[PDB]
Amino acid sequence: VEPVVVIDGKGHLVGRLASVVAKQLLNGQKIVVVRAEELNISGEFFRNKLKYHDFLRKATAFNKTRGPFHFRAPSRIFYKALRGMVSHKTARGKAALERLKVFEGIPPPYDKKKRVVVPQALRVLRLKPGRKYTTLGKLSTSVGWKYEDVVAKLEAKRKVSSAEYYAKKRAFTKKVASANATAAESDVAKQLAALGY
Amino acid sequence: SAQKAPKWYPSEDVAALKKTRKAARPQKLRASLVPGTVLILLAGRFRGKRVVYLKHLEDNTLLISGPFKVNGVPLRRVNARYVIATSTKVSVEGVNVEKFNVEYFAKEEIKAERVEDQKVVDKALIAEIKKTPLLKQYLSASFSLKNGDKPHMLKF
Amino acid sequence: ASLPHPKIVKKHTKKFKRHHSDRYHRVAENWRKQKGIDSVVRRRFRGNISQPKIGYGSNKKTKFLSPSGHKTFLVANVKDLETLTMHTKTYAAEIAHNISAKNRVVILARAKALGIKVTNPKGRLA
Amino acid sequence: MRVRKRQSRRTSTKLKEGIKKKASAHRKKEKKMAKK
Amino acid sequence: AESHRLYVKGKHLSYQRSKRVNNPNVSLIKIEGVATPQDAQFYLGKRIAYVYRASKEVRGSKIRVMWGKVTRTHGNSGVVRATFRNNLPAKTFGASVRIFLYPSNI
RNA sequence: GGAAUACUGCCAGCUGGGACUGAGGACUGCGACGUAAGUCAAGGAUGCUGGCAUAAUGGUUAUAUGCCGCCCGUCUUGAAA
RNA sequence: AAAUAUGUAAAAUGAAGAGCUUUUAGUGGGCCAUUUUUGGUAAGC
RNA sequence: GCCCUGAAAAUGGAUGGCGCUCAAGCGUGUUACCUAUACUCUACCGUCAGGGUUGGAUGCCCUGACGAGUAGGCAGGCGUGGAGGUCAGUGACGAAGCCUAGACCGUAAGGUCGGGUCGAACGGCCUCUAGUGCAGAUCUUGGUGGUAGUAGCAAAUA
RNA sequence: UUGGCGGAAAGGCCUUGGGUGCUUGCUGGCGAAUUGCAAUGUCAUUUUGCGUGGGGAUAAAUCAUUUGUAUACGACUUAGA
Prior knowledge:
This is part of a larger assembly, with chains A, B, C, D and E.
Chain B lengths: L36 E5 L8 E7 L5 E4 L2 H4 L4 E3 L4 E7 L22 H18 L5 H6 L16
Chain C lengths: L39 H4 L27 E5 L2 H4 L9 E5 L5 H14 L12
Parallel strand pairs in C: 1-2
Chain E lengths: L6 E11 L4 E10 L5 H4 L6 E7 L9 E12 L4 E6 L11 E5 L6
Antiparallel strand pairs in E: 1-2, 1-6, 2-5, 3-4, 3-6, 4-5
Chain C binds four RNA strands through strand 1 and helix 3.
């Protein structure tokens, strides 16, 4: 219902998230996916790496600059999975893809917005315990992505700042909770509680 | 001749219609529409206003009033399908609305008969309204849907 | 003011144009049926042009009627016009293309006197 | 890490219909040899 | 107040269709807050408007309206079928529509 | 020992919401309700109300968008190429 | 002795067209599969 | 029973793709839902059929059922040159023809009207008659494109 | 206006002080009608111009000429008040 929906991609299964995002974009919702380096794929790391290497060997023989472009970054791997689920060669598909942004980490301005999750795509809710799974950052770094460390350092800095913000918010929440607990005995409090509030 | 005349012509005798078996029986309103109920206008220049339902007219319209002094909605008629009937009611025992009808609202400045009738009806409506708390403020306020409001589940 | 009629419904307002008349200038749009044994248009494959057929025929009550509800009768002079003297609710007069302006004014005056609708009273008007 | 070619699971119409004919012939010969 | 809305928001999803043929005479509409056909039953017969803007002013407005109604429910998830006086343009797949509370049975 | 409920079926039981359609054109028929007069949902839509009266509806045309649509004819063979 | 699978002759179900005599046109290849059957191959057949 | 092995080459590629792992795989059960020119109901067109019609009968009224199609068969229509009759038909106050982002009728062959251009003839109806309707024939004659301002005008000393 | 903080795409967050409004925390008093029983019934934000009054700043590139670290033509690279 929001004008823009920001999905924290951490702990999501790539294909189920891609299916959800594709339907939302086609239905007209603006979506920003952050932390694409923390997406999961079910199956062993060696298996998913083998699948990527098969993708890598696919190329146009007489001119490689024409063949499939193998993007290494996690955001681009997710974008590929999504474009496969959109009819991207039509004007409607292009307009749908114009409604999507995908990022590694959480850069500005989304680092101060609310992030949501997609429960039907969450690894902890979908995969059975004991099943091996792959992380997109490791897969990307093994296939040639070169910014894993930079993103990790930036995310550590963001987490430090976010922890400070949350400490201040926790203090203010405690103060407001006390101010409301001192008002639980009033006539307005009794009337509101009778009405359910 | 540019065109040869037809040897046969359709008749110009305008035949009458057959006798129609379609009687006009009185409209049956839904149960929630009883006089005195507060109803929310859904369209018109007064959309979102909360008014009081007085009586059911012969052209199947509903006679409503704000009352005019509470929210600025005069004595009017409205269509029943363009309102929501809420559960709040006010007594209309002391209100005399037997002089209002289609000929009263015939259109064919603002008439003094309508002004004075509005004052007279507003007097008794105000007297009855001042019994339950916050009802005058409720009638002054306008209605709208909020974020997350689901009309199929809202109780009106 | 014609005789009352049902609302006129046209089943197919679009013109039936010949196959590949758009593609070739030498192929005119006048309808022709394709007669090749392998014609996909003849065999009625999906996504091709529609072809004329009797099912498209219009209701017999509102056939030949103008929107005003009259059938068109071409008149060349006042004697032709006066044939419609009694059938003014069923027939409207259309002046023939080759009538001169000075005869058109006479025909229009006579039609107005007789209460006959004229489909083209603006032809050759000064 | 030279990943080799993978066999296609996309079945061709020619192979599918040939297999159908092979199965029919197999059943007919099964009946005849059961008779014999 | 800051809200004056007397309608429910909806999205124009697509035409009624099979896999390979569409019917532009029926539009599928996703109404906000409606997740089952049983709840979708509330909105049957309600008026629906597509409100758009045009550069050229026409009879004292630059705002144009396509009117229609909700006809029946569609599927298992609360999507409805709607019919408009003129069929909705196809570029409006994913655009917003207004479902009004009238004609009202409450 | 006494019930209830489920399930399956029946009602010439009652009642609410939605959609598409309104063909026909004096009367004639079969019925229903009434002591009668007559009335009726009974051989197919009527009643009340509003705005506009023109590009507003609509037509035509150019484009855009969604889905669909292989280049015609001949000639061969079941058939296709 | 239930009937897998054909004939003759007389109850079921359906049917508004039937019989005869003169006449006229086009046609005169096959491919694929099921079933039964006879003969075969390493296997197809 | 499911899983691995149970051999397979050579441009890069395919359960249709994406992707999917308490599946979006496999076996099975119960429901809901989606949509064909199919089924039901209605309107309309045509064909056929069955009833009625002494007061445009080649018609008119009522009712029912049907509608794929090559060769071929049968029927009803549309258009063209010329001929007999007729409309005491159209016309220099503008015939014919041509152009038209305009209008109307017909399922269609086609027909009609407005506007422009133009300058001398031409139509409706009932009949007669034929050198009577074109996308093709490596068709005939004439006209005209792309290719393209491209190939080329570099022998003969200057 | 004070004082900070944020470089991942910071372009935003927080705070200081005074001024200026509103306040539905509570009680009152006037107005609304006629848009005629509905008609988005017009309230958002992109850009481009024209007019006013408040300020600000006073260039280059290309051809032509020229070089050969370049060169089929373009292009490239030098120089010239």
